[PDB]
Design a protein around this ligand. Structure first.
Ligand SMILES: [Cu+2]
Ligand SMILES: [Cu+2]
Ligand SMILES: [Cu+2]
Ligand SMILES: [Cu+2]
Ligand SMILES: [Cu+2]
Ligand SMILES: [Cu+2]
Ligand SMILES: [Cu+2]
Ligand SMILES: [Cu+2]
Ligand SMILES: [Cu+2]
Ligand SMILES: [Cu+2]
Ligand SMILES: [Cu+2]
Ligand SMILES: [Cu+2]
Ligand SMILES: [Cu+2]
Ligand SMILES: [Cu+2]
Ligand SMILES: [Cu+2]
Ligand SMILES: [Cu+2]
Ligand SMILES: [Cu+2]
Ligand SMILES: [Cu+2]
Ligand SMILES: [Cu+2]
Ligand SMILES: [Cu+2]
Ligand SMILES: [Cu+2]
Lengths: 295, 295, 295
């Protein structure tokens, strides 16, 4: 796209504020931002807020979201689809033109770990170029295992293809498959989907802790066989809904756009890889690390 | 196949009748029928009854099926495998030769949403060329959420490949991935697996309704990440068995031949896309629409 | 690998012994062994004990495993990762050099049907060349359906690619996809992952029996849509954990490394195929047979 040549829009922080007991404002941008997806490989991604996947959104069950998208792309329209919400797609997930803003309102009444993404046609193009993310909706009454959890993090799986190449997006294997982490609390890492960051700067834990991960596989195209090396999931909640409670899973199957909450214990000091167990994808980037120490 | 050149056998209605409180007769054909799978693209499909996927079959839990297959194919043998039934494959799912008929009998004692398909070797060939479908077995005591459902439809996912090309069927990506709808009540649409019909003639609903879909992914080869845009599944029953009850799923993973019953609420007027969230497949056809109006 | 040319190390029996009420010794080798994966096709596999998949391991819930790996490979390091265990990957799943041994200790406190595999980098290479298997951990209090089961077997799904070709392992479709069976009791078959053995020498059963299969899809790369032709699973336990109990499934989705316990009834004499319902994979080898007789 001629109007994207040389464009590299600096990342913009997510803006969010509560405006009622059951009402939240969220303000995001659509923007064109260079991301290093593999060492030496820059992808001029289509993004929310200059991150790919986009920034984490966390709301409460029963919150109405008043969402504003500011489109900074000079030529391409963009939009937003939150899987958390009940909405009319043809009224509420509509395009925002270049240099314009749009505001849409809709409720999040289901707890869980949901994908969000651009909904502009062709949706494959927009998701593959980087316009994906996660929204977490916290359950009103928690999970039954809350009291057991010592530490939690967010992980997101996505793929990267040949740059802006619809033939590859439709017909080709992924070039890279990658994890990212998004911050839930101050000090947590906040990273983009790349092959290396979470190997060089592992997630941190302490020996004997129960860890919870909020996970989502945003695709665009692949399923994920999510596994943490050296442990067994004690508890799994499919899509993060507390009702969908599995126990003792070695590996969690996630569809494209599929989420879960998973919990496991790290018993011994060391580095624990986190993978999709489709090992072709792992080899192409999808290995993160959890370093577990005595302190 | 030289004996299929110029062959286009008109579709034949499914014949079905109850012959006892727990016994049903079903009569199908195997036939060679031109189907428009994408605009301008005709596939000379191998079919049941001149539909691909085939006609919908609905029976009750505990029904014995007395199934007759009339083979209208001039040269290829065909057969039938219902996933609903307990049967001896080597006695009851056997070939029927060109211009012959065969009758087989077997019980359907498990409720759910089952694939059927030709079972003739090579089974890949027969399924890929179009010989697939769904049988629904209604549970004796219903689903616990029956009283909530306002409207229901059947959707089927399948792929199309290069015509009758076993190398592509085994080694290639699908050319098209498509939804079809099969009628449960008078007035419901009844369509073939194509890229366009359910976009141009969307399924219909009213604002505020709870919708149930009976879904099956017949493949041959792909899994499906089934999602309805703008809603969350309130209830999911894996394979349509009432025991396998999930809640609040954004996306349902279906294996190849996998089924479910899914229920969701449409809250607002508009058009709601239905997709597999493996967006390469969506781009290649697998997007249906649900138009939701005040009336 | 020049140092593997002409190497064909005879298979070595698994060594296992109980050494306490909650403690077991297991001794395996890593070795280079020619396996016929398809008729006329020899793969010089990287293996545990000269089998691919490796030998079956069965322990009890709460057993500590004292595992020894003797590396017979002349040049490549190997290691072992059991998905059953809680362990530090960077201390306990480490490499054993050529012509050396290493012993590692760790608990199996979760019941189920777990993958094991080499964990040496690149793990894709080691798994794809044949270093995979299953460990079963028997639940302390059984499964609720134990009293119903008449007969049981172990089945494993894996893929084979072009020989030792990392580009194919990462980017290509599988050449073959195959089932194997591993013995649980004297007289049971014990086979390698190949396209033919379980078609020519089917698993055996009697009419009216309830069969249990312990299944795992070791990959490396594919998911599996596991189905037995002519029946419906009465009961499924995901990953073999008794809590994760489904009923009446036609087909079980398994992630890569995913396991299950499945139970079904064979009602009539005949041969019942067992497949992954991703029929491209079935066509490439993944069809086993269960011959069901009056005796
Ligand atoms: Cu309130
Ligand atoms: Cu507001
Ligand atoms: Cu966009
Ligand atoms: Cu979506
Ligand atoms: Cu792929
Ligand atoms: Cu703790
Ligand atoms: Cu664990
Ligand atoms: Cu009766
Ligand atoms: Cu009859
Ligand atoms: Cu046929
Ligand atoms: Cu089948
Ligand atoms: Cu494909
Ligand atoms: Cu209603
Ligand atoms: Cu909904
Ligand atoms: Cu004891
Ligand atoms: Cu010992
Ligand atoms: Cu190895
Ligand atoms: Cu593993
Ligand atoms: Cu493949
Ligand atoms: Cu019995
Ligand atoms: Cu059955």
């Amino acid at each position: 796209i001629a109007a994207h040549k040389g464009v590299n829009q600096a990342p913009v922080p997510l803006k969010m504020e509560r405006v009622g007991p059951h009402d939240v404002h969220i303000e995001m941008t659509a923007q064109i931002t260079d991301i290093e997806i593999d060492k030496g490989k820059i992808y001029k991604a289509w993004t929310f807020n200059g991150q790919a996947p986009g920034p984490l959104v966390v709301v409460n069950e029963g919150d109405t979201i008043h969402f504003t998208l500011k489109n900074m792309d000079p030529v391409v329209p963009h939009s937003m689809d939150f899987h958390a919400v009940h909405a009319s797609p043809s009224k509420d997930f509509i395009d925002v033109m270049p240099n314009k803003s749009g505001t849409f309102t809709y409720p999040a009444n289901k707890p869980g770990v949901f994908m969000y993404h651009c909904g502009t046609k062709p949706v494959l193009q927009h998701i593959a170029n980087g316009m994906h993310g996660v929204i977490i909706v916290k359950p009103k009454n928690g999970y039954p295992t809350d009291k057991e959890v010592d530490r939690e993090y967010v992980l997101i799986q996505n793929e990267w293809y040949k740059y802006n190449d619809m033939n590859d997006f439709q017909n080709g294997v992924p070039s890279y498959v990658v994890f990212s982490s998004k911050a839930l609390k101050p000090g947590d890492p906040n990273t983009n989907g790349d092959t290396f960051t979470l190997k060089e700067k592992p997630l941190l834990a302490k020996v004997g802790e129960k860890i919870r991960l909020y996970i989502n596989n945003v695709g665009p195209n692949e399923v994920s066989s999510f596994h943490v090396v050296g442990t067994v999931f004690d508890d799994v909640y499919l899509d993060g809904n507390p009702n969908n409670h599995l126990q003792g899973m070695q590996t969690v199957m996630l569809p494209a756009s599929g989420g879960a909450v998973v919990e496991f214990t790290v018993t011994r000091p060391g580095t624990y890889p986190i993978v999709t167990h489709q090992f072709n994808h792992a080899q192409k980037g999808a290995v993160a690390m959890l370093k577990v120490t005595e302190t």
